Amino acid sequence: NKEQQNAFYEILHLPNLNEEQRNAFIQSLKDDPSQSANLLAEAKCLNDAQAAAEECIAEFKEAFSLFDKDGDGTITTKELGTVMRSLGQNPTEAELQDMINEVDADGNGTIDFPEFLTMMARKM
Ligand SMILES: [Ca+2]
Ligand SMILES: [Ca+2]
């Protein structure tokens, strides 16, 4: 309860959060203060997505790692499928292909972290 306390305060005073959002980070950092640095980062991104670039990239990396299970810095068509069918969805292997193709810049059949970034940026 030393650097925890700091983050706590900082979240309290992040201007742009609404008080439902504020409340979320707060009581959740109470139940698990070991997670202090991570909740601050997420809120920092939530509050100013332009100003909190590193914190957004931070969180977005962990999102990447979720699909990129073998960790070769790339999301294959298979890894997409592997993740999705684990979520009870049943895609035809032709939609998995259309889903990668729809966010693939250099058109090499997979998805790199920069391409991943663009997709996130796009909606919103
Ligand atoms: Ca991979
Ligand atoms: Ca690519």
Residue numbers in the entry: 217 to 267, 1005 to 1077
According to the publication:
Here we propose a novel method for connecting the pre-existing α-helices of two proteins into a single extended helix using a chemical cross linker. EY-CBS (3,3′-ethyne-1,2-diylbis-{6-[(chloroacetyl)amino]benzenesulfonic acid}) is a chemical cross linker that can react simultaneously with two cysteines in the i and i+11 positions of the α-helix19. To test whether EY-CBS detects the formation of a helix, we chose two amino acid residues separated by 11 amino acids in the proposed fusion helix and mutated them to cysteines. In conclusion, we have developed a new method that can convert two pre-existing α-helices into one long extended helix.
Of the 21 fusion proteins, 16 failed to display any significant reactivity towards EY-CBS. We were unable to crystallize any of these proteins except 6,761, presumably due to the structural instability of the interface between the fused protein components. The crystallized 6,761 fusion protein is composed of an N-terminal protein A and a C-terminal calmodulin domain. The crystal structure of the 6,761 fusion protein was determined at 2.7 angstrom resolution. The structures of the two domains of the 6,761 fusion protein were easily superimposable with those of the separate protein A and calmodulin domains, and there were no noticeable structural changes except around the fusion site. In the crystal structure, it could be seen that the two helices designed to fuse had not formed a continuous helix, and the cysteines introduced to bind EY-CBS were close to one another and formed an unexpected disulfide bridge. The last and the first turns of the helices of the protein A and calmodulin domains, respectively, formed irregular loops and made sharp ∼120 degree turns. The crystal structure of the connecting loop and the disulfide bridge formed a distinct electron density demonstrating that the fusion site was structurally stable. It appears that the 6,761 fusion protein can be crystallized because the interface between the two protein components of the fusion protein is stabilized by the opportunistic disulfide bridge. We conclude that that simple-minded ligation of two helices does not guarantee the formation of a single extended helix, and that high reactivity of the fusion helix with EY-CBS is a reliable indicator of helix formation.
